[PDB]
């Protein structure tokens, strides 16, 4: 029932009592940013692809 | 009603309480939402509150008025004092 999760993600609850966000591709809404709406796995995978301009590896 | 505000109710679980109030109250109403604080009218009232499958009746009275319908209903289950 992952499509239930996704179509509830695309829809917005009628109150601010009920609220969450999740990736367009990933399930497991835990650990998701509000700057891109992308889950940790999808974000890390697209960042290893250089999707966001400037995602680098820290060397101090 | 909270510790931050006066007696305020969402007025959708009290809605049916009152709707039956103008008609010689009988208490049990199918309400397991947790959005109504209590009032001097909720004395004697019971509501079938959902725990995870069934809707347990919870007695309400005029003892204290500093809680909601969710606080006046056991929302969880305990160990049943089991050693397993």
């Amino acid at each position: 029932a992952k499509k239930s999760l996704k179509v509830k993600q695309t829809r917005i609850p009628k109150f601010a009592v009920r609220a969450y966000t999740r990736c367009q591709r990933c399930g497991r809404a835990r650990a998701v940013l509000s700057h891109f709406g992308v889950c940790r796995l999808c974000f890390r995978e697209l960042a290893y692809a250089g999707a966001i301009p400037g995602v680098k590896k820290a060397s101090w | 009603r909270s510790a931050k505000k006066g007696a305020f109710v969402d007025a959708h679980l009290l809605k049916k309480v009152i709707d039956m109030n103008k008609q010689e109250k009988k208490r049990p109403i199918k309400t397991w939402s947790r959005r109504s604080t209590i009032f001097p009218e909720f004395v004697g009232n019971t509501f079938a509150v959902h725990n995870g499958k069934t809707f347990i009746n919870v007695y309400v009275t005029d003892d204290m008025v500093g809680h909601k319908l969710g606080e006046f209903s056991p929302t969880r289950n305990f160990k049943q004092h089991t050693a397993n």
Partner: protein
């Protein structure tokens, strides 16, 4: 071990293709999503002509796209039959009102990328021909028409239930240590009746003169 060298060498070795700069972080994800869809339309359209890169250069309502086509006849043909369709279809995803600007740019050594090489390796693996000769020809072609060292691998299964004759092909300058290797790396999740098969390619795009800058 061997943390994935995909993100490990963007910015220091690999280049960034799609640049986008919006305002406060509300529709930045929208810009990212629109850019990736528009740029991946080309990538999912052609797999025989093998279009490689389309840089959508966006900054505050200044969008510039640039297609790098390997075969102009496959991307244009007679009476520009292909491009107008793109000029139609992207017009539905990029917006009717906004302008659609792009041109076919020339480039040397068009196989210094990894995605198309991986696609060709998969085609050779499942091309209904003696497979070993097919991959010998494909590697000879990628090494011949202009390129640096290659690193091609296939993992998964042999069209059975086990990959026993996997071949790890390394040629020329493949230093994972060197921070100037100019190595582009891609992975392909091929779909078949034996589960997803991973075809991964590292490719050196030319020894730049000791540069740590995104050239």
């Amino acid at each position: 071990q061997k943390v994935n060298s995909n993100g490990l060498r963007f910015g220091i070795n690999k280049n960034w293709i799609s640049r986008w700069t919006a305002n406060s972080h509300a529709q930045t994800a929208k810009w990212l999503i629109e850019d990736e869809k528009i740029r991946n339309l080309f990538f999912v359209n052609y797999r025989n002509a093998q279009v490689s890169n389309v840089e959508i250069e966006r900054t505050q309502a200044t969008v510039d796209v640039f297609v790098y086509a390997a075969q102009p006849a496959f991307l244009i043909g007679s009476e520009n039959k292909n491009i107008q369709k793109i000029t139609k279809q992207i017009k539905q995803i990029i917006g009717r009102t906004t302008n659609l600007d792009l041109t076919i740019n020339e480039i040397g050594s068009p196989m210094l990328s990894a995605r198309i090489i991986a696609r060709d390796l998969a085609n050779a693996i499942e091309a209904r021909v003696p497979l070993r000769t097919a991959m010998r020809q494909s590697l000879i072609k990628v090494l011949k028409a202009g390129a640096n060292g290659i690193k091609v691998l296939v993992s998964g299964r042999l069209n059975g239930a086990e990959i026993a004759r996997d071949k790890m092909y390394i040629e020329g300058n493949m230093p994972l240590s060197t921070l100037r290797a100019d190595i582009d790396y891609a992975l392909e999740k091929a779909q078949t009746t034996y589960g997803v098969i991973g075809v991964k390619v590292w490719i050196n795009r030319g020894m730049i003169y000791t540069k740590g800058l995104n050239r």
